[PDB]
């Protein structure tokens, strides 16, 4: 259940 | 007149640039350059002795003293020193090869001429040590 | 002079009036003597003991003639060196080059 | 007259002396020597042809002028020997074949490797086969 | 030591001499290598089979003359050669003695002025014999001479 | 000490002062005509006045010669080189 | 000087590199011969010309193959999230983060 | 059961 | 059971 | 004349650019540069 | 003078008429005395 590429435009930092 | 004549020949012997300036009259740049070359050539005559008399004993003593104080690494005992007005000579030889090798650049794609051989002869013609200049087959 | 660490160690210049050199016709330097006129206060400690031990009281400003003798040794073809003050060799000044 | 009085007899004696000592190969007995202040003349003739032939370079695609004839007349006008200067018909065919042979290997090696690499990476099991072949291994 | 050498009334003599020796020194012993070891082309090709072998032969010869040029500079030959050239201008005669090199030590060659040597030479031009004088102190003498 | 040092350092110095005397005389004469204070006499002291020579080429010539010799023998560029025998070094390293 | 004259003379032959009429190899040999240099080894032997042709062919073959392999290998590494984890465990990386 | 390429952007150092 | 291209990016020496 | 002669050699000893300028006559630029180096060279001796 | 912090600390110049130095023939500075003529108000506290 994982995907490698880093996501930056809208997602929250957490 | 005699005072100027004696001072003129004393000036040349003492390497004074008033010698190229001359007693009077008009002068030219090119001749001043050439006669100044005569001054620097006879300059080599007077300090030729000082190379052996002063420069070498200075280096020999300094080499031993800096070795005793460990300021320089211990020499291999096979190292000799010339005092040369040298490394600049080696740089001049290398620069000649690079310009000479750049002349070979337009014909990099020549199917006839063995460019590797030409570079080796050019390097030999210059007189530099060719050990390691040409890439070995494994390096290529 | 022998370097002492990184200390400032300028070389000493002797004019013709302060030294003598004996040299054979072959051109070999047989012997050299240098004369140093150094004040008692400015004397090195080793030389100072030689002047003090010999006798007499010397003013700090009083000049001392120090003679350093470098000569060709008969054996091994080397230079033996020592410093002489007031007719007596200084202890520890002996050396070879 | 020093060419005849001094230079030529000097060369004549040297040729026989160097032949007796085997320092030069035995001459064909049909070799004559001129003492010329020569080879430099032949070089000068060749350099003129190259420059004159370079004047024909902008017209390489001319459909009217027979450039091969013009080059031969230029070489004749200079006076050099034209034997072998112009490529023979079989030589031009060899150059024709060699040009095609070259990129035949260039595209052949490129096409062979791409398919070979693709089939090597077709499936992970087949990829271990490449590893086990060259000596590599999957589990590290 | 007590002799005083008067300056000549004209200066072209000293001026011409120094210029002459310097120009002779520059032409005869320049910074660039003034000698080359040449291998005769036909014999070499008779002993080696490929031009590559001939090229590495020239590399070895090029190395040899570099060592010779390095030896000349490291042993102050140019200092001695310039003095010899000056002697040749005024005396036309000088004797150069090259001592046998002991290891890599400083081994300058000894210059003999015309007043320190004699040579006998036949009309054909061969050196029949030659004697040199060395006036060396007892301490400075080598052990065998001592 | 035996040999040359048998006399003593001061004794040797005083004996050889006579041998070096002509060179001191010549040095004083050369200084007289170029730069009188460059080679003072043994009797010269802090009260000695050195007269300017009537001609200036000697002072000008000495300064120019000493400066030109200094640039030739000890320039900013390295004037000594340590050279290793190329054949001997190659016989030691691979 | 002889070598540098040959290079300048040979560099003059560059404009006619694609000429179909003139035997450039013959002219190059004649130019070198007229200069007087040793002509042994300056011209490539037929086997040497074949070797150079092979080397540049192998240059394109290996360079295209290295690119083609990595693109294909990357595709299999990212083919599935399960194979995605396999690449991480191979190089020593981890999927869980 | 293995994948050839290095994984670089997000994978835990492990 | 063989594949032609050399494997270089992640595999070990063995 | 003797004033100019002494002032000329004093100018060189003091490195004054009257020495390159000269008392009179015509002067060329290139000759000045080479003799200006001489002043810069005798500059080395005085601060040594 | 010994620098007190970052204050303005120019170095003092003594002309030949304000100091004496004794030097042996070897060239070592055996001793040297400087003379300062300072007013009572301008004197430092310790000298005052």
> What CA–CA distance (Å, rounded) separates F31 from C54?
41
> Between chains, do F79 and B10 touch, taking CB under 8 Å as contact?
no
Q: What DSSP string describes chain D?
A: -HIIIIIHHHHHHHHHHHHHTTSSPPP-S---------HHHHHHHHHHHHHHHHHTGGGTT-SSS-HHHHHHHHHHHHT---TTTBPPHHHHHHHHHHHHHHHHHHHHHHHHHHHHHHHHTSSHHHHHHHHHHHT-BS--
Interchain CB contact of B130 with F (< 8 Å): no
Residue K6: C-alpha distances to residues E144, K1, K9, K44 (Å)? 73, 13, 8, 19
- Cβ-based neighbour number of residue D16 at 10 Å: 12
Contact D45, D79 (CB under 8 A): yes
Q: Look at residues I8, F86, F40, C68 and name the one whose alpha carbon lies nearest to residue E62.
A: F86
> What CA–CA distance (Å, rounded) separates E72 from F85?
12
> What CA–CA distance (Å, rounded) separates B23 from C27?
43
B118-130 burial, b at 16+ Cβ within 10 Å, e below that, comes to bbbbbbbbbbbeb
**G72: part of which helix (H) or strand (E)?**
helix G46-77
> Between chains, do G65 and D106 touch, taking CB under 8 Å as contact?
no
From the number of C-beta atoms within 10 Å of its C-beta (0-12, 13-18, 19+), residue C74 rates as middle
**J6: part of which helix (H) or strand (E)?**
helix J2-13
Chain J residues whose CB is inside 8 A of the B32 CB are 30-31, 34
From the number of C-beta atoms within 10 Å of its C-beta (0-12, 13-18, 19+), residue E1 rates as exposed
Structure tokens at H1: 């059961």
> What CA–CA distance (Å, rounded) separates B51 from B82?
9
Please enumerate residues of D whose Cβ is less than 8 A from a Cβ of H: 121, 124, 127-128, 138-139
Chain A residues whose CB is inside 8 A of the H7 CB are 4
Chain C residues whose CB is inside 8 A of the K20 CB are none
Interchain CB contact of C25 with E (< 8 Å): yes
> Between chains, do G44 and B118 touch, taking CB under 8 Å as contact?
no
Instruction: For tokens 């034997």, name the residue.
Output: D83
| G67: three-class secondary structure by DSSP | helix
Contact B79, F81 (CB under 8 A): no
The whole-angstrom distance between E28's CA and the closest CA on chain B is 14
What are the two backbone dihedrals, phi and then psi, of residue E119, each rounded to the nearest 5 degrees? -135, 140
State the chains in contact with C (3 or more Cβ–Cβ pairs under 8 Å). B, E, F, K
> What CA–CA distance (Å, rounded) separates G12 from B107?
10
Interchain CB contact of G23 with D (< 8 Å): yes
Residue G86: C-alpha distances to residues D140, E50, F88, H2, H4 (Å)? 12, 56, 58, 5, 8
Q: Look at residues C45, C38, C50, C48 and name the one whose alpha carbon lies nearest to residue C91.
A: C50
Instruction: For tokens 């030590």, name the residue.
Output: E105
Contact K35, K18 (CB under 8 A): yes
Contact D35, D59 (CB under 8 A): no
> What CA–CA distance (Å, rounded) separates F32 from F26?
10
Instruction: For tokens 């007087």, name the residue.
Output: G36
Q: Which residues pair with H12 in a beta bridge?
A: G94
Tell which of A1, A2, A4, A11 to mutate to test the H interface (max H CBs under 10 Å): A4
> What CA–CA distance (Å, rounded) separates E110 from E79?
11
Q: Which residues pair with E110 in a beta bridge?
A: E97
Q: What is the DSSP letter of B51?
A: I
Structure tokens at D70: 């013009």
Q: Look at residues E119, E126, E128, E75 and name the one whose alpha carbon lies nearest to residue E94.
A: E119
Does the CA dihedral F21-F24-F28-F34 come out positive or negative? Answer: positive
> What CA–CA distance (Å, rounded) separates F53 from F35?
8
**E67: part of which helix (H) or strand (E)?**
helix E51-74
CA Rg value for chain H:
8
G51-77 burial, b at 16+ Cβ within 10 Å, e below that, comes to eebeeebeebbeebbeebbbebbbebb
What are the two backbone dihedrals, phi and then psi, of residue D18, each rounded to the nearest 5 degrees? -75, -25
Interchain CB contact of B58 with G (< 8 Å): no
Q: Which of residues 13-32 of K touch C (CB under 8 A)?
A: 22, 24-26, 28, 30-31
Instruction: For tokens 């070489």, name the residue.
Output: D75
Beta strand pairing status for B79-80 and C79-85? unpaired
Beta strands per DSSP E along chain E: 95-97, 110-112, 117-121, 127-132
Q: What is the DSSP letter of B55?
A: I
> What CA–CA distance (Å, rounded) separates B80 from B61?
13
From the number of C-beta atoms within 10 Å of its C-beta (0-12, 13-18, 19+), residue F70 rates as middle
> What CA–CA distance (Å, rounded) separates D87 from F54?
86
> What CA–CA distance (Å, rounded) separates D95 from G21?
11
> Between chains, do G95 and A2 touch, taking CB under 8 Å as contact?
yes
> What CA–CA distance (Å, rounded) separates J2 from B71?
58
> Between chains, do F67 and J44 touch, taking CB under 8 Å as contact?
yes
The alpha helices in F34-83, defined as continuous H runs, are 57-73
Instruction: For tokens 């008033």, name the residue.
Output: B18
> What CA–CA distance (Å, rounded) separates F19 from F7?
17
Q: What is the DSSP letter of F80?
A: B
Q: Which residues pair with C36 in a beta bridge?
A: C66
Q: Look at residues G93, G61, G62, D112 and name the one whose alpha carbon lies nearest to residue I8.
A: G62
Structure tokens at B66: 């800096």
From the number of C-beta atoms within 10 Å of its C-beta (0-12, 13-18, 19+), residue D130 rates as buried
> What CA–CA distance (Å, rounded) separates F37 from F30?
11
Interchain CB contact of C58 with F (< 8 Å): no
> What CA–CA distance (Å, rounded) separates G9 from G31?
7
Chain H residues whose CB is inside 8 A of the I10 CB are 4-6
What are the two backbone dihedrals, phi and then psi, of residue B4, each rounded to the nearest 5 degrees? -65, -40
Does the CA dihedral K19-F43-F60-B36 come out positive or negative? Answer: negative
Chains C and B physically touch (3 or more Cβ atom pairs below 8 Å): yes
Q: Resolution, in Å, please?
A: 2.7
The whole-angstrom distance between J30's CA and the closest CA on chain B is 6
Contact C90, C50 (CB under 8 A): yes
Contact C92, C80 (CB under 8 A): no
Q: For chain A, count helices (H), then strands (E).
A: 0, 0
Largest CA distance in chain E: 69
> Between chains, do A5 and H7 touch, taking CB under 8 Å as contact?
no
Structure tokens at G75: 């595709």
Structure tokens at D117: 């690499």
The whole-angstrom distance between D123's CA and the closest CA on chain H is 10
For D140, the closest of I3, I8, I12 (CB atoms) is: I12
């Amino acid at each position: 259940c994982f995907s490698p590429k880093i996501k930056t435009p809208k997602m929250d930092t957490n | 007149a005699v005072s100027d004549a004696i001072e003129a020949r004393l000036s040349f012997a003492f390497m004074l640039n008033s010698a190229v300036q001359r007693t009077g009259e008009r002068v030219t740049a090119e001749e001043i350059r050439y006669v100044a070359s005569e001054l620097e050539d006879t300059l080599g005559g007077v300090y030729s002795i000082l190379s052996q008399e002063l420069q070498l004993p200075l280096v020999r003593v300094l080499l031993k003293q800096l070795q005793a104080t460990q300021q320089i690494p211990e020499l291999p005992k096979e190292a000799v020193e010339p005092t040369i007005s040298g490394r600049g000579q080696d740089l001049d030889k290398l620069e000649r090869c690079v310009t000479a090798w750049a002349a070979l650049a337009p014909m990099r794609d020549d199917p006839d001429i063995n460019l590797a051989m030409i570079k080796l002869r050019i390097a030999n013609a210059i007189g530099i040590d060719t050990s390691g200049i040409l890439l070995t087959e494994e390096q290529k | 002079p022998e370097p002492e660490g990184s200390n400032y160690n300028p070389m000493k210049l002797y004019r013709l009036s302060s030294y003598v050199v004996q040299r054979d016709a072959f051109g070999n330097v047989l012997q050299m003597v240098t004369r140093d006129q150094i004040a008692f206060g400015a004397l090195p400690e080793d030389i100072r003991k030689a002047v003090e031990g010999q006798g007499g009281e010397k003013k700090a400003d009083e000049t001392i003639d120090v003679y350093t003798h470098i000569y060709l040794d008969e054996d091994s073809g080397e230079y033996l060196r020592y410093e002489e003050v007031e007719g007596m060799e200084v202890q520890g000044s002996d050396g070879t080059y | 007259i020093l060419s005849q009085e001094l230079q030529l007899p000097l060369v004549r004696v040297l040729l026989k002396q160097l032949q007796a000592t085997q320092q030069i190969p035995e001459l064909p007995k049909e070799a004559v020597e001129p003492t010329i202040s020569g080879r430099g003349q032949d070089l000068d003739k060749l350099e003129r042809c190259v420059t004159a032939w370079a004047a024909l370079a902008p017209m390489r695609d001319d459909p009217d002028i027979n450039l091969a004839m013009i080059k031969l007349r230029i070489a004749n006008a200079i006076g050099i020997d034209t034997s072998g200067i112009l490529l023979t018909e079989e030589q031009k065919q060899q150059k024709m074949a060699q040009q095609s042979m070259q990129m035949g290997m260039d595209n052949g090696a490129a096409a062979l490797a791409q398919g070979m690499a693709a089939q090597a990476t077709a499936s992970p099991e087949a990829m271990a086969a490449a590893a086990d072949s060259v000596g590599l291994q999957p589990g590290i | 030591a007590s002799t005083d050498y008067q300056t000549p009334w004209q200066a072209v003599g000293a001026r011409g001499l120094n210029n002459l020796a310097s120009k002779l020194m520059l032409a005869l012993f320049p910074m660039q290598t003034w000698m080359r070891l040449t291998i005769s082309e036909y014999e070499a090709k008779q002993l080696l089979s490929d031009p590559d072998g001939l090229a590495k032969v020239d590399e070895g010869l090029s190395m040899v003359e570099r060592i010779i040029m390095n030896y000349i500079e490291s042993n102050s030959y140019r200092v001695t050669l310039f003095e010899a050239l000056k002697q040749l201008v005024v005396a036309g005669n000088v004797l150069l003695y090259l001592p046998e090199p002991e290891g890599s030590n400083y081994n300058p060659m000894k210059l003999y002025r015309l007043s320190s040597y004699v040579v006998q030479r036949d009309a054909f031009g061969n050196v029949l014999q030659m004697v040199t004088r060395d006036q060396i102190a007892f301490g400075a003498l080598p052990e065998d001479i001592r | 000490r035996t040999g040359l040092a048998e006399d003593g350092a001061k004794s040797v110095y005083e004996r050889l002062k006579n041998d070096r005397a002509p060179y001191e005389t010549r040095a004083q004469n050369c200084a007289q005509y170029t730069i009188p204070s460059l080679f003072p006499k043994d009797s010269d002291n802090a009260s000695t006045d050195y007269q300017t020579p009537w001609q200036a080429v000697g002072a000008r010539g000495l300064n120019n010669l000493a400066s030109k010799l200094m640039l030739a023998l000890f320039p900013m560029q390295t004037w000594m080189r340590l050279t290793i025998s190329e054949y001997e070094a190659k016989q030691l390293l691979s």
